[PDB]
Design an enzyme around this catalytic site. Structure first.
Site, PDB file in Angstrom:
ATOM      1  CG  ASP A  75      -0.300  -0.047   2.507  1.00  0.00           C
ATOM      2  OD1 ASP A  75       0.744  -0.649   3.269  1.00  0.00           O
ATOM      3  OD2 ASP A  75      -1.241  -0.246   3.180  1.00  0.00           O
ATOM      4  CD  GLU A  95       2.198  -3.833   3.095  1.00  0.00           C
ATOM      5  OE1 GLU A  95       2.777  -4.222   2.570  1.00  0.00           O
ATOM      6  OE2 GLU A  95       0.870  -3.446   2.778  1.00  0.00           O
ATOM      7  CE  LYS A  97      -0.002  -5.522   6.122  1.00  0.00           C
ATOM      8  NZ  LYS A  97      -0.915  -6.119   4.928  1.00  0.00           N
TER       9      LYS A  97
END
EC number: 3.1.21.4
Lengths: 261, 261
Positions: A75, A95, A97
């Site tokens: 992402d 990334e 999360k």
DNA sequence: TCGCGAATTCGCG
DNA sequence: TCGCGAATTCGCG
């Protein structure tokens, strides 16, 4: 921060940019600091590319592919630089999360659970999927001396300090970071060999047991242990720091462009 | 199979033992073949053990632990042998995952999806969690020359060949293994560097880019590409084969027990 | 079209 | 008690 880095950081904070948008900002900052170099941002890497890189290291590697157009999409995307040989070298992979919505539940008068009477929800394990992309990029950069993988954690499942959340009832719910009911931070420690979190672990370590030699690829695992959301300005500084380190290790293959250009 | 290995295999098939129960059977077979050696089965390994092993390799490794009694529980357990120095060395670590219930749905007249009209369900990604335990055991065995990690896959999301499933209506639903709508087999290939699946990859490879030296720890990824369930007899043979390889690499530290005992 | 990613609710000792 | 594991249903380009 230092000069223009402070200006770019304020722009990130003013718009609260997502990790993917902060990665694009890092490329602009890098283009500004090193005008003699060429940078690019990519949002995906197909499995055929990873396999090609694996074959160059050893002919028996990267010889498996079930779905022709398989790929990975971090992402945060990927930032690259062109070396003196015309090849692209990865400088950054980000990334972000999220896991654990307990702080949001207790901020309100919501009780979770099968019976609807628990203040907290037993923490899951979906965060373990993070290891896949880390392994893919590590295989893609197996010939490199640096591993610029940055992972940002957020939620009630990644606390590093105790917090007290007051509900509308007035009752203060006290959460302890060391409680295995919520903390999933240890489900990620294998990614950086138990090295310090919230640190830049870009430069690969070279250990050895008994005359053997091994190269370790440790990911930089940053967490917001307060329980709050990540600040875009601090995300940018962290990511820019890791990108600069990648260029340092890559120095020998960028020299001709900083001189003969 | 060879002698008693065929007898133990028939017992596994007669009861259709789970992976954890097959791991216990492998220890019995090993005790039978090598009476001079001591074996044991363990169902868990705490994070404190992994960190201790990491510290012996490099003092800056394994220095993180948020939940004191954190651990990992591979559903297949762990088999170990005692060397000439009184220390336990892992010979086998097994795991079995399942994903994809499309064959079961189309065997009946069940239509899935938000609208309830699809023959197939878009495949998920929970199988990616598998990489965590693989990384933990790899860190635990970073000083070893072998990596006996076996992963067994099962379901409609791990096909290696085309299959035709007939529903109660009479209509034959044809599934293609290379379809990215279902195949998640590539979400695991990073675990063994793209090396062949359904193979014993226990002996570590030592590659090198340009005078560097790296040790690769590849997991053995076995799949039932037919779509059917795993046969306990063939699971046992595979696991026993991998355990024997572990003993071969460990040969130098087991000699005194096969001679002076 | 097709192929990747979000991350959650609980059961189990 | 507390801490680990199962693996699924869809949204998104």
């Amino acid at each position: 921060s230092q000069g223009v880095i402070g200006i770019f950081g304020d722009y990130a904070k003013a718009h609260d940019l997502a990790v993917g948008e902060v990665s694009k900002l890092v490329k602009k900052a890098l283009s500004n600091e090193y005008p003699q170099l060429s940078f690019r941002y990519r949002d995906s890497i197909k499995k055929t590319e990873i396999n090609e890189a694996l074959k160059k290291i050893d002919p028996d590697l990267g010889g498996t592919l079930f779905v022709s157009n398989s790929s990975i999409k971090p992402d945060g995307g990927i930032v690259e630089v062109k070396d003196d040989y015309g090849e692209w070298r990865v400088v950054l992979v980000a990334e972000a999360k999220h896991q654990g919505k307990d702080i949001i539940n207790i901020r309100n008068g919501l009780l979770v659970g099968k019976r609807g009477d628990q203040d907290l929800m037993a923490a899951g394990n979906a965060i373990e999927r993070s290891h896949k992309n880390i392994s893919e990029i590590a295989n893609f950069m197996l010939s490199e001396s640096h591993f610029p993988y940055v992972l940002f954690l957020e939620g009630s499942n990644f606390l590093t300090e105790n917090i007290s959340i007051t509900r509308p009832d007035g009752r203060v719910v006290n959460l302890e970071y060391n409680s295995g009911i919520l903390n999933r931070l240890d489900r990620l420690t294998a990614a950086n060999y138990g090295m310090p979190i919230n640190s830049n672990l870009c430069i690969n370590k070279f250990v050895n047991h008994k005359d053997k030699s091994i190269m370790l690829q440790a990911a930089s695992i940053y967490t917001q242990g307060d329980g709050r959301e990540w600040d875009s300005k601090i995300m940018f500084e962290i990511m820019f720091d890791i990108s600069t380190t990648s260029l340092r290790v890559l120095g020998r293959d960028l020299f001709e462009q900083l001189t003969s250009k």
